[PDB]
Amino acid sequence: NAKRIEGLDSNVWVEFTKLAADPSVVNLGQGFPDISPPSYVKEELSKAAFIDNMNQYTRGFGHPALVKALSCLYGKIYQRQIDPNEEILVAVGAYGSLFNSIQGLVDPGDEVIIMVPFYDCYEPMVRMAGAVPVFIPLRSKPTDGMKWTSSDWTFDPRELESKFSSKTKAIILNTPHNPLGKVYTRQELQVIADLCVKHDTLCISDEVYEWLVYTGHTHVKIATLPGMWERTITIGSAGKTFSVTGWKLGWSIGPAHLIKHLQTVQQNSFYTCATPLQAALAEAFWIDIKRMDDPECYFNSLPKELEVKRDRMVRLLNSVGLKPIVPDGGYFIIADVSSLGADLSDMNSDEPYDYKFVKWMTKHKKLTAIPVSAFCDSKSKPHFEKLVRFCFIKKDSTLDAAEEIFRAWN
Amino acid sequence: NAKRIEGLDSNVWVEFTKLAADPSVVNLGQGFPDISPPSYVKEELSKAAFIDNMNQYTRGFGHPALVKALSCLYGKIYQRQIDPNEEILVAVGAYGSLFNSIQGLVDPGDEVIIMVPFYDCYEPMVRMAGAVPVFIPLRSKPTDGMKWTSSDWTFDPRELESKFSSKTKAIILNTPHNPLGKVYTRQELQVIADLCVKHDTLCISDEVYEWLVYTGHTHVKIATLPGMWERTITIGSAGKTFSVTGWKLGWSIGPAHLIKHLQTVQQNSFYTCATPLQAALAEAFWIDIKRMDDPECYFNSLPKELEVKRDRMVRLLNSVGLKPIVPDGGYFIIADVSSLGADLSDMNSDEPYDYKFVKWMTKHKKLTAIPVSAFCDSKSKPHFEKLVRFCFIKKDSTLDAAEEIFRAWN
């Protein structure tokens, strides 16, 4: 195997799917919606499938109708003109976008800052570019009194400074955050922008859950903050925008001198994406660009729908003294499990507690989730290993089944 | 802009798509079927669209139905039990497969051998892995007196042998060849396997047009030669197979200890591929696999529709003094251009003769084509720049419109 990939062959995120394969279990694990996508997203596929051209190659950098749509959606959010051809790159997921960003922008020996826990591909994505990932964790503050929330987690600004050096090339920001659910604040974003400008680094901002933010919170885009347009790549996703995780396209959006470089990675990698998916996506974005101010719009209705289910899931969790972190955004909830009956002394690896715990819960209670340590670097895992992550972008009947389970815990 | 991508951002093909700016030209340049896809290919895409589960994530290394069908198709071909999870990987086109193969197997400073002219990604992919492309031209043999054909082009075994050394990681082999349309012979495939075996190198084999062989030729897979299974990666295409160029789905078939490395690249790049494209393809495949021996099998009915379009195209090319090279396979025809009017004083700013001619024929005849020099290392262009590539996977209307142009060529 070539050197750029030594020790990056880690899938336990296969195991977590072995686990869940047994069909009398309730899968609250991987981030797999089981609600219907919006009809008209399905309709538009079918319609693109019957148009010959749409089954043939389109533009490398993104189907013109898709980037036209994007440029006008994000145009509105940025409060500024976004240039469909030079400032957008369409890629294979947000996943490929992160890859474009890092591969196009990051060199052997460079430092990339990663806030722990992270979406798990950041790390390995950095090591493959031959760069040094540099970790700093989220830490929790005292509560309000009532609930534990996503907002109760933050970073220490001074600790953050201390991470930047002449070697820092970039920092990777994920907001809404996976797995926390944290929606960053304008104060929290301005500490990070301060340092990127102060230090002339980039920022890769992974905002695929931009629409999924709940009440009391707001998505702010660090790329809109003074000095950051020039230095930010902001990445979005079809899959999370429209609950069609299987469509795998996403977008990078930022300046031409940066999206230049992303563009060359894509050109020399896979070249182009699928045409019908993009054609149909572009229609969906249109269907939904035009009603932004209505609640019929998917950008509004979805998060309204998911908030109810978030709340139903905290309660469920609470009802066994799993200790939930009410998230501000996205569609995962994390729960401390330690106050339950530590039950695992007779499982005899040295996997972290949460792997062992999630295994136990899978065996005994018939529910799976994701151990938070999966989202952590190795020196980081012990500070996170009583934490376990559940996903709620599910249909009632699934939350029903899980309701069934939690009721009969003891 | 990362060192890995230093100058790798030239896309001469943006400029070509400029010439295929209508103003009403018959566009014979780029591999862009404008026949319709098979009707059931389209049918299954929509069926898929309406199933909710086929819009969500699937096996990262390949939709399971799909790797099942690949395994059963290619096991029929290889004469062997091919393991659908460990010997296949589904990637974003052949294009992504090559990328996988190179990134996951080639190190900085390895040498990779490439046949000129070559599908034009080969060079930048190798260069992006920091390896050194080593080139060796295809050369003409005396013709049989009657016609120029792709098999009048071959390699010198002794020249090839001398390109191997101890830095050679691999040779990239493409058959049927793009752009010659050459179907490598057993004898030629044998010389490569000898050198691979004796030198312990890999062969990455690009066989996307593998079903497009015309009368008097068979596709033989080097991976099936004694000793080549263990050293070969062999790549196929949904785009080329089903005439759906915009679906960008390809696959690598080969031994576990090689696939795992491609799997690793794929897992740290794009991860999973569109569920719905892959659901539908699987069913496209099953449909054709059950009629392999029948003339309705798309695998049989396509080459045969095409041979006729080819022979139509040779006539037309001859009609007009463009000396064509009848291809044994694939759907491009190359034509020697040298002996018309040379006619190009408007220009000769000396970028390559073929480019100037393609520009001319666009302006004055409203036919576009692709200058073969564009598939050549810089040191090779002079040997190939009177050569021009035309595409013939075209509907009758389109070839019709081509007749009117050659017919009027005079």
PDB file of N, CA and C in Angstrom, chain A residues 1-4 8-9 33 36 42 45-46 49 52 55-57 95-96 99 103-104 106-107 124 128-129 240 243-248 261 264 267-272 274-277, chain B residues 1-4 8-11 32 36-37 42 45-46 49-50 52 55-57 95 99 103-104 106-107 124-125 129 240 243-248 261 267-270 272 274-276:
ATOM      1  N   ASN A   1       0.806  -1.252   0.000  1.00  0.00           N
ATOM      2  CA  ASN A   1       0.000   0.000   0.000  1.00  0.00           C
ATOM      3  C   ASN A   1       0.831   1.290   0.000  1.00  0.00           C
ATOM      4  N   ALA A   2       0.509   2.294  -0.809  1.00  0.00           N
ATOM      5  CA  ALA A   2       1.325   3.529  -0.849  1.00  0.00           C
ATOM      6  C   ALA A   2       1.395   4.274   0.494  1.00  0.00           C
ATOM      7  N   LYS A   3       2.474   5.011   0.734  1.00  0.00           N
ATOM      8  CA  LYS A   3       2.732   5.572   2.046  1.00  0.00           C
ATOM      9  C   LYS A   3       1.677   6.558   2.561  1.00  0.00           C
ATOM     10  N   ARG A   4       1.101   7.375   1.689  1.00  0.00           N
ATOM     11  CA  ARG A   4       0.102   8.400   2.021  1.00  0.00           C
ATOM     12  C   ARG A   4      -1.116   7.761   2.703  1.00  0.00           C
ATOM     13  N   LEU A   8      -4.474   4.311   7.637  1.00  0.00           N
ATOM     14  CA  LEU A   8      -5.753   5.010   7.494  1.00  0.00           C
ATOM     15  C   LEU A   8      -6.853   4.062   7.107  1.00  0.00           C
ATOM     16  N   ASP A   9      -6.601   2.774   7.311  1.00  0.00           N
ATOM     17  CA  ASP A   9      -7.496   1.731   6.824  1.00  0.00           C
ATOM     18  C   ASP A   9      -8.552   1.381   7.867  1.00  0.00           C
ATOM     19  N   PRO A  33     -31.374   8.577   7.642  1.00  0.00           N
ATOM     20  CA  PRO A  33     -32.775   8.965   7.788  1.00  0.00           C
ATOM     21  C   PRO A  33     -33.694   7.850   7.392  1.00  0.00           C
ATOM     22  N   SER A  36     -39.366   9.655   4.943  1.00  0.00           N
ATOM     23  CA  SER A  36     -39.344   9.919   3.510  1.00  0.00           C
ATOM     24  C   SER A  36     -38.630  11.189   3.120  1.00  0.00           C
ATOM     25  N   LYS A  42     -37.827  13.061  -5.043  1.00  0.00           N
ATOM     26  CA  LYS A  42     -37.954  11.780  -5.713  1.00  0.00           C
ATOM     27  C   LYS A  42     -38.528  12.039  -7.106  1.00  0.00           C
ATOM     28  N   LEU A  45     -35.752  13.286  -9.705  1.00  0.00           N
ATOM     29  CA  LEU A  45     -34.996  12.170 -10.246  1.00  0.00           C
ATOM     30  C   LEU A  45     -35.717  11.590 -11.436  1.00  0.00           C
ATOM     31  N   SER A  46     -36.785  10.846 -11.181  1.00  0.00           N
ATOM     32  CA  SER A  46     -37.479  10.103 -12.223  1.00  0.00           C
ATOM     33  C   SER A  46     -37.591  10.885 -13.494  1.00  0.00           C
ATOM     34  N   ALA A  49     -34.387  11.016 -15.114  1.00  0.00           N
ATOM     35  CA  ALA A  49     -33.925   9.757 -15.663  1.00  0.00           C
ATOM     36  C   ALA A  49     -34.449   9.546 -17.102  1.00  0.00           C
ATOM     37  N   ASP A  52     -32.629  11.764 -22.023  1.00  0.00           N
ATOM     38  CA  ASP A  52     -31.317  11.377 -22.575  1.00  0.00           C
ATOM     39  C   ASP A  52     -30.137  12.242 -22.170  1.00  0.00           C
ATOM     40  N   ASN A  55     -28.523  11.820 -18.807  1.00  0.00           N
ATOM     41  CA  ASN A  55     -27.852  10.621 -18.525  1.00  0.00           C
ATOM     42  C   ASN A  55     -26.443  10.628 -19.104  1.00  0.00           C
ATOM     43  N   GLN A  56     -26.086  11.736 -19.714  1.00  0.00           N
ATOM     44  CA  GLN A  56     -24.716  11.856 -20.297  1.00  0.00           C
ATOM     45  C   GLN A  56     -23.937  12.859 -19.535  1.00  0.00           C
ATOM     46  N   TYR A  57     -22.627  12.908 -19.772  1.00  0.00           N
ATOM     47  CA  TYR A  57     -21.735  13.834 -19.117  1.00  0.00           C
ATOM     48  C   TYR A  57     -22.263  15.271 -19.081  1.00  0.00           C
ATOM     49  N   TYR A  95     -18.498  15.082   1.500  1.00  0.00           N
ATOM     50  CA  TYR A  95     -17.355  14.243   1.787  1.00  0.00           C
ATOM     51  C   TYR A  95     -16.227  14.504   0.806  1.00  0.00           C
ATOM     52  N   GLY A  96     -16.544  14.486  -0.478  1.00  0.00           N
ATOM     53  CA  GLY A  96     -15.589  14.822  -1.507  1.00  0.00           C
ATOM     54  C   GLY A  96     -15.235  16.284  -1.404  1.00  0.00           C
ATOM     55  N   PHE A  99     -12.489  16.451   1.049  1.00  0.00           N
ATOM     56  CA  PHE A  99     -11.326  15.962   0.317  1.00  0.00           C
ATOM     57  C   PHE A  99     -10.758  16.998  -0.706  1.00  0.00           C
ATOM     58  N   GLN A 103      -7.071  18.208   0.067  1.00  0.00           N
ATOM     59  CA  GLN A 103      -6.087  17.886  -0.947  1.00  0.00           C
ATOM     60  C   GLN A 103      -5.569  19.101  -1.768  1.00  0.00           C
ATOM     61  N   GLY A 104      -6.467  19.995  -2.158  1.00  0.00           N
ATOM     62  CA  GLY A 104      -6.136  21.222  -2.913  1.00  0.00           C
ATOM     63  C   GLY A 104      -5.392  22.290  -2.121  1.00  0.00           C
ATOM     64  N   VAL A 106      -3.593  21.858   1.196  1.00  0.00           N
ATOM     65  CA  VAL A 106      -2.837  21.516   2.365  1.00  0.00           C
ATOM     66  C   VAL A 106      -1.704  20.640   1.931  1.00  0.00           C
ATOM     67  N   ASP A 107      -0.555  20.954   2.501  1.00  0.00           N
ATOM     68  CA  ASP A 107       0.715  20.385   2.116  1.00  0.00           C
ATOM     69  C   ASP A 107       1.323  19.581   3.175  1.00  0.00           C
ATOM     70  N   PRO A 124      -7.990  11.755   9.243  1.00  0.00           N
ATOM     71  CA  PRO A 124      -7.318  10.834   8.335  1.00  0.00           C
ATOM     72  C   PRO A 124      -7.158  11.641   7.057  1.00  0.00           C
ATOM     73  N   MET A 128      -3.496  12.094   5.299  1.00  0.00           N
ATOM     74  CA  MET A 128      -3.208  11.717   3.912  1.00  0.00           C
ATOM     75  C   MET A 128      -2.562  12.809   3.117  1.00  0.00           C
ATOM     76  N   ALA A 129      -2.865  14.054   3.402  1.00  0.00           N
ATOM     77  CA  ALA A 129      -2.211  15.151   2.723  1.00  0.00           C
ATOM     78  C   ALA A 129      -0.836  15.332   3.306  1.00  0.00           C
ATOM     79  N   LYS A 240     -27.791  16.006   3.429  1.00  0.00           N
ATOM     80  CA  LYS A 240     -28.374  16.633   4.582  1.00  0.00           C
ATOM     81  C   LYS A 240     -29.365  17.706   4.217  1.00  0.00           C
ATOM     82  N   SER A 243     -32.370  15.058   2.869  1.00  0.00           N
ATOM     83  CA  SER A 243     -32.605  13.722   3.362  1.00  0.00           C
ATOM     84  C   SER A 243     -32.516  12.700   2.259  1.00  0.00           C
ATOM     85  N   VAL A 244     -31.488  12.846   1.437  1.00  0.00           N
ATOM     86  CA  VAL A 244     -31.203  11.903   0.392  1.00  0.00           C
ATOM     87  C   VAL A 244     -29.702  11.681   0.422  1.00  0.00           C
ATOM     88  N   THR A 245     -29.311  10.996   1.526  1.00  0.00           N
ATOM     89  CA  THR A 245     -27.945  10.821   1.926  1.00  0.00           C
ATOM     90  C   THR A 245     -27.338   9.969   0.827  1.00  0.00           C
ATOM     91  N   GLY A 246     -28.160   9.292   0.039  1.00  0.00           N
ATOM     92  CA  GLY A 246     -27.665   8.392  -0.968  1.00  0.00           C
ATOM     93  C   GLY A 246     -27.352   9.048  -2.296  1.00  0.00           C
ATOM     94  N   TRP A 247     -27.635  10.333  -2.393  1.00  0.00           N
ATOM     95  CA  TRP A 247     -27.402  11.076  -3.621  1.00  0.00           C
ATOM     96  C   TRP A 247     -25.957  11.513  -3.735  1.00  0.00           C
ATOM     97  N   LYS A 248     -25.321  11.705  -2.593  1.00  0.00           N
ATOM     98  CA  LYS A 248     -23.912  12.036  -2.560  1.00  0.00           C
ATOM     99  C   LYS A 248     -23.557  13.043  -3.641  1.00  0.00           C
ATOM    100  N   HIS A 261      -8.202  25.725  -6.623  1.00  0.00           N
ATOM    101  CA  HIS A 261      -7.308  24.676  -6.247  1.00  0.00           C
ATOM    102  C   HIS A 261      -8.094  23.423  -5.956  1.00  0.00           C
ATOM    103  N   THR A 264      -8.888  21.817  -9.342  1.00  0.00           N
ATOM    104  CA  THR A 264      -7.859  20.946  -9.887  1.00  0.00           C
ATOM    105  C   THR A 264      -7.859  19.599  -9.206  1.00  0.00           C
ATOM    106  N   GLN A 267     -10.715  17.707 -10.907  1.00  0.00           N
ATOM    107  CA  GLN A 267     -10.408  17.505 -12.349  1.00  0.00           C
ATOM    108  C   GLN A 267      -9.525  16.306 -12.509  1.00  0.00           C
ATOM    109  N   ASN A 268      -8.601  16.124 -11.585  1.00  0.00           N
ATOM    110  CA  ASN A 268      -7.621  15.065 -11.688  1.00  0.00           C
ATOM    111  C   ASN A 268      -7.954  13.888 -10.790  1.00  0.00           C
ATOM    112  N   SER A 269      -9.212  13.787 -10.396  1.00  0.00           N
ATOM    113  CA  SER A 269      -9.641  12.767  -9.458  1.00  0.00           C
ATOM    114  C   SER A 269     -10.788  11.957 -10.020  1.00  0.00           C
ATOM    115  N   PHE A 270     -11.952  12.567 -10.109  1.00  0.00           N
ATOM    116  CA  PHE A 270     -13.114  11.935 -10.690  1.00  0.00           C
ATOM    117  C   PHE A 270     -13.783  12.751 -11.772  1.00  0.00           C
ATOM    118  N   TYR A 271     -13.400  14.002 -11.876  1.00  0.00           N
ATOM    119  CA  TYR A 271     -13.712  14.828 -13.021  1.00  0.00           C
ATOM    120  C   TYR A 271     -15.053  15.524 -13.017  1.00  0.00           C
ATOM    121  N   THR A 272     -16.111  14.773 -12.806  1.00  0.00           N
ATOM    122  CA  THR A 272     -17.464  15.245 -12.989  1.00  0.00           C
ATOM    123  C   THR A 272     -18.399  14.449 -12.076  1.00  0.00           C
ATOM    124  N   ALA A 274     -22.477  12.972 -11.387  1.00  0.00           N
ATOM    125  CA  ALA A 274     -23.511  12.312 -12.107  1.00  0.00           C
ATOM    126  C   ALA A 274     -24.460  13.370 -12.580  1.00  0.00           C
ATOM    127  N   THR A 275     -25.019  13.178 -13.736  1.00  0.00           N
ATOM    128  CA  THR A 275     -25.830  14.205 -14.244  1.00  0.00           C
ATOM    129  C   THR A 275     -27.253  14.222 -13.735  1.00  0.00           C
ATOM    130  N   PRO A 276     -27.933  13.072 -13.691  1.00  0.00           N
ATOM    131  CA  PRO A 276     -29.337  13.158 -13.319  1.00  0.00           C
ATOM    132  C   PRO A 276     -29.442  13.614 -11.888  1.00  0.00           C
ATOM    133  N   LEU A 277     -28.541  13.152 -11.021  1.00  0.00           N
ATOM    134  CA  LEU A 277     -28.679  13.556  -9.622  1.00  0.00           C
ATOM    135  C   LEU A 277     -28.607  15.061  -9.580  1.00  0.00           C
TER     136      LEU A 277
ATOM    137  N   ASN B   1      -2.203  26.619  -2.704  1.00  0.00           N
ATOM    138  CA  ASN B   1      -2.234  25.593  -3.735  1.00  0.00           C
ATOM    139  C   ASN B   1      -1.137  24.565  -3.550  1.00  0.00           C
ATOM    140  N   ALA B   2      -1.524  23.310  -3.361  1.00  0.00           N
ATOM    141  CA  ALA B   2      -0.667  22.341  -2.747  1.00  0.00           C
ATOM    142  C   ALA B   2       0.321  21.899  -3.831  1.00  0.00           C
ATOM    143  N   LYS B   3       1.523  21.545  -3.452  1.00  0.00           N
ATOM    144  CA  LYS B   3       2.527  21.136  -4.401  1.00  0.00           C
ATOM    145  C   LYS B   3       2.100  19.985  -5.275  1.00  0.00           C
ATOM    146  N   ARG B   4       1.332  19.067  -4.701  1.00  0.00           N
ATOM    147  CA  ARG B   4       0.896  17.901  -5.453  1.00  0.00           C
ATOM    148  C   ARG B   4       0.252  18.305  -6.753  1.00  0.00           C
ATOM    149  N   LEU B   8      -1.127  21.225 -12.938  1.00  0.00           N
ATOM    150  CA  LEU B   8      -1.985  20.086 -13.282  1.00  0.00           C
ATOM    151  C   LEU B   8      -3.358  20.620 -13.503  1.00  0.00           C
ATOM    152  N   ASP B   9      -3.433  21.913 -13.729  1.00  0.00           N
ATOM    153  CA  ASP B   9      -4.687  22.627 -13.821  1.00  0.00           C
ATOM    154  C   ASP B   9      -5.030  23.053 -15.250  1.00  0.00           C
ATOM    155  N   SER B  10      -4.138  22.781 -16.176  1.00  0.00           N
ATOM    156  CA  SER B  10      -4.499  22.963 -17.579  1.00  0.00           C
ATOM    157  C   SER B  10      -5.687  22.065 -17.929  1.00  0.00           C
ATOM    158  N   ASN B  11      -6.759  22.656 -18.431  1.00  0.00           N
ATOM    159  CA  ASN B  11      -7.745  21.878 -19.151  1.00  0.00           C
ATOM    160  C   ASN B  11      -7.997  22.360 -20.578  1.00  0.00           C
ATOM    161  N   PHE B  32     -19.520  11.377 -26.210  1.00  0.00           N
ATOM    162  CA  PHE B  32     -20.777  11.828 -25.735  1.00  0.00           C
ATOM    163  C   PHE B  32     -21.712  11.148 -26.713  1.00  0.00           C
ATOM    164  N   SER B  36     -29.935   7.244 -27.451  1.00  0.00           N
ATOM    165  CA  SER B  36     -30.593   7.137 -26.174  1.00  0.00           C
ATOM    166  C   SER B  36     -30.007   6.005 -25.407  1.00  0.00           C
ATOM    167  N   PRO B  37     -30.041   6.069 -24.071  1.00  0.00           N
ATOM    168  CA  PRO B  37     -29.676   4.877 -23.377  1.00  0.00           C
ATOM    169  C   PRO B  37     -30.746   3.798 -23.580  1.00  0.00           C
ATOM    170  N   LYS B  42     -32.782   3.715 -17.977  1.00  0.00           N
ATOM    171  CA  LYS B  42     -33.711   4.752 -17.588  1.00  0.00           C
ATOM    172  C   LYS B  42     -34.899   4.278 -16.759  1.00  0.00           C
ATOM    173  N   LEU B  45     -33.669   3.606 -13.126  1.00  0.00           N
ATOM    174  CA  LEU B  45     -33.363   4.814 -12.394  1.00  0.00           C
ATOM    175  C   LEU B  45     -34.546   5.484 -11.693  1.00  0.00           C
ATOM    176  N   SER B  46     -35.671   5.549 -12.383  1.00  0.00           N
ATOM    177  CA  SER B  46     -36.877   6.082 -11.793  1.00  0.00           C
ATOM    178  C   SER B  46     -37.499   5.154 -10.778  1.00  0.00           C
ATOM    179  N   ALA B  49     -35.734   5.826  -7.774  1.00  0.00           N
ATOM    180  CA  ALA B  49     -35.979   7.099  -7.213  1.00  0.00           C
ATOM    181  C   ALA B  49     -37.171   7.020  -6.241  1.00  0.00           C
ATOM    182  N   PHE B  50     -38.160   6.205  -6.546  1.00  0.00           N
ATOM    183  CA  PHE B  50     -39.370   6.219  -5.762  1.00  0.00           C
ATOM    184  C   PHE B  50     -39.322   5.331  -4.545  1.00  0.00           C
ATOM    185  N   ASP B  52     -37.568   4.730  -0.916  1.00  0.00           N
ATOM    186  CA  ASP B  52     -36.993   5.712  -0.043  1.00  0.00           C
ATOM    187  C   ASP B  52     -35.624   5.252   0.363  1.00  0.00           C
ATOM    188  N   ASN B  55     -32.597   6.012  -1.675  1.00  0.00           N
ATOM    189  CA  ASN B  55     -32.105   7.366  -1.636  1.00  0.00           C
ATOM    190  C   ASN B  55     -31.262   7.646  -0.438  1.00  0.00           C
ATOM    191  N   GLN B  56     -30.896   6.621   0.294  1.00  0.00           N
ATOM    192  CA  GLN B  56     -30.062   6.802   1.452  1.00  0.00           C
ATOM    193  C   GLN B  56     -28.798   5.998   1.348  1.00  0.00           C
ATOM    194  N   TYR B  57     -27.875   6.225   2.257  1.00  0.00           N
ATOM    195  CA  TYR B  57     -26.558   5.627   2.193  1.00  0.00           C
ATOM    196  C   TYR B  57     -26.562   4.136   1.895  1.00  0.00           C
ATOM    197  N   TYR B  95     -13.081   6.786 -14.098  1.00  0.00           N
ATOM    198  CA  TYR B  95     -12.197   7.893 -13.770  1.00  0.00           C
ATOM    199  C   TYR B  95     -11.793   7.783 -12.295  1.00  0.00           C
ATOM    200  N   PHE B  99      -8.113   6.739 -10.370  1.00  0.00           N
ATOM    201  CA  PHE B  99      -7.642   7.579  -9.330  1.00  0.00           C
ATOM    202  C   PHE B  99      -7.379   6.728  -8.080  1.00  0.00           C
ATOM    203  N   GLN B 103      -3.600   6.516  -6.452  1.00  0.00           N
ATOM    204  CA  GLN B 103      -3.399   6.995  -5.099  1.00  0.00           C
ATOM    205  C   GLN B 103      -3.109   5.872  -4.104  1.00  0.00           C
ATOM    206  N   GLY B 104      -3.677   4.708  -4.308  1.00  0.00           N
ATOM    207  CA  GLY B 104      -3.534   3.790  -3.234  1.00  0.00           C
ATOM    208  C   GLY B 104      -2.396   2.860  -3.423  1.00  0.00           C
ATOM    209  N   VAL B 106       0.599   3.808  -5.808  1.00  0.00           N
ATOM    210  CA  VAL B 106       1.764   4.412  -6.339  1.00  0.00           C
ATOM    211  C   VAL B 106       2.388   5.459  -5.420  1.00  0.00           C
ATOM    212  N   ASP B 107       3.671   5.331  -5.133  1.00  0.00           N
ATOM    213  CA  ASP B 107       4.383   6.279  -4.263  1.00  0.00           C
ATOM    214  C   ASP B 107       5.174   7.329  -5.024  1.00  0.00           C
ATOM    215  N   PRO B 124      -1.539  13.164 -15.605  1.00  0.00           N
ATOM    216  CA  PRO B 124      -1.750  13.931 -14.348  1.00  0.00           C
ATOM    217  C   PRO B 124      -2.051  13.012 -13.081  1.00  0.00           C
ATOM    218  N   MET B 125      -2.820  11.952 -13.216  1.00  0.00           N
ATOM    219  CA  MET B 125      -2.920  11.077 -12.054  1.00  0.00           C
ATOM    220  C   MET B 125      -1.519  10.591 -11.622  1.00  0.00           C
ATOM    221  N   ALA B 129       0.306  11.604  -7.903  1.00  0.00           N
ATOM    222  CA  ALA B 129       0.900  10.725  -6.869  1.00  0.00           C
ATOM    223  C   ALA B 129       2.381  10.914  -6.629  1.00  0.00           C
ATOM    224  N   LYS B 240     -19.662   3.678 -20.094  1.00  0.00           N
ATOM    225  CA  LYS B 240     -19.318   2.998 -21.320  1.00  0.00           C
ATOM    226  C   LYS B 240     -20.172   1.790 -21.543  1.00  0.00           C
ATOM    227  N   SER B 243     -24.093   3.228 -21.939  1.00  0.00           N
ATOM    228  CA  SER B 243     -24.286   4.488 -22.618  1.00  0.00           C
ATOM    229  C   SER B 243     -24.922   5.542 -21.756  1.00  0.00           C
ATOM    230  N   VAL B 244     -24.598   5.529 -20.484  1.00  0.00           N
ATOM    231  CA  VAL B 244     -25.015   6.563 -19.581  1.00  0.00           C
ATOM    232  C   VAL B 244     -23.846   7.266 -18.959  1.00  0.00           C
ATOM    233  N   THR B 245     -23.399   8.299 -19.618  1.00  0.00           N
ATOM    234  CA  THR B 245     -22.078   8.782 -19.432  1.00  0.00           C
ATOM    235  C   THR B 245     -22.047   9.617 -18.162  1.00  0.00           C
ATOM    236  N   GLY B 246     -23.148  10.285 -17.908  1.00  0.00           N
ATOM    237  CA  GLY B 246     -23.371  11.054 -16.719  1.00  0.00           C
ATOM    238  C   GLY B 246     -23.697  10.310 -15.420  1.00  0.00           C
ATOM    239  N   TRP B 247     -23.629   8.980 -15.400  1.00  0.00           N
ATOM    240  CA  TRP B 247     -23.863   8.229 -14.216  1.00  0.00           C
ATOM    241  C   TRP B 247     -22.577   8.042 -13.413  1.00  0.00           C
ATOM    242  N   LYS B 248     -21.427   8.179 -14.043  1.00  0.00           N
ATOM    243  CA  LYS B 248     -20.168   8.145 -13.312  1.00  0.00           C
ATOM    244  C   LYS B 248     -20.077   7.042 -12.280  1.00  0.00           C
ATOM    245  N   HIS B 261      -6.322  -1.650  -0.604  1.00  0.00           N
ATOM    246  CA  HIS B 261      -5.727  -0.349  -0.789  1.00  0.00           C
ATOM    247  C   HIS B 261      -6.572   0.654  -1.547  1.00  0.00           C
ATOM    248  N   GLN B 267     -12.248   5.229   0.945  1.00  0.00           N
ATOM    249  CA  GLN B 267     -12.817   5.565   2.234  1.00  0.00           C
ATOM    250  C   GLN B 267     -12.367   6.873   2.843  1.00  0.00           C
ATOM    251  N   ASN B 268     -11.240   7.377   2.379  1.00  0.00           N
ATOM    252  CA  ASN B 268     -10.735   8.673   2.823  1.00  0.00           C
ATOM    253  C   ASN B 268     -10.868   9.717   1.741  1.00  0.00           C
ATOM    254  N   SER B 269     -11.704   9.475   0.750  1.00  0.00           N
ATOM    255  CA  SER B 269     -11.982  10.464  -0.269  1.00  0.00           C
ATOM    256  C   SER B 269     -13.425  10.854  -0.478  1.00  0.00           C
ATOM    257  N   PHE B 270     -14.227   9.934  -0.955  1.00  0.00           N
ATOM    258  CA  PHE B 270     -15.604  10.217  -1.289  1.00  0.00           C
ATOM    259  C   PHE B 270     -16.506   9.306  -0.506  1.00  0.00           C
ATOM    260  N   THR B 272     -18.881   6.765  -0.049  1.00  0.00           N
ATOM    261  CA  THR B 272     -19.866   5.953  -0.729  1.00  0.00           C
ATOM    262  C   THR B 272     -20.367   6.630  -1.979  1.00  0.00           C
ATOM    263  N   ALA B 274     -23.605   7.101  -5.110  1.00  0.00           N
ATOM    264  CA  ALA B 274     -25.049   7.251  -5.129  1.00  0.00           C
ATOM    265  C   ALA B 274     -25.741   5.920  -4.977  1.00  0.00           C
ATOM    266  N   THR B 275     -26.528   5.749  -3.922  1.00  0.00           N
ATOM    267  CA  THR B 275     -27.423   4.602  -3.903  1.00  0.00           C
ATOM    268  C   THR B 275     -28.292   4.408  -5.184  1.00  0.00           C
ATOM    269  N   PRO B 276     -29.017   5.456  -5.675  1.00  0.00           N
ATOM    270  CA  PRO B 276     -29.976   5.178  -6.759  1.00  0.00           C
ATOM    271  C   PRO B 276     -29.334   4.813  -8.115  1.00  0.00           C
TER     272      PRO B 276
END
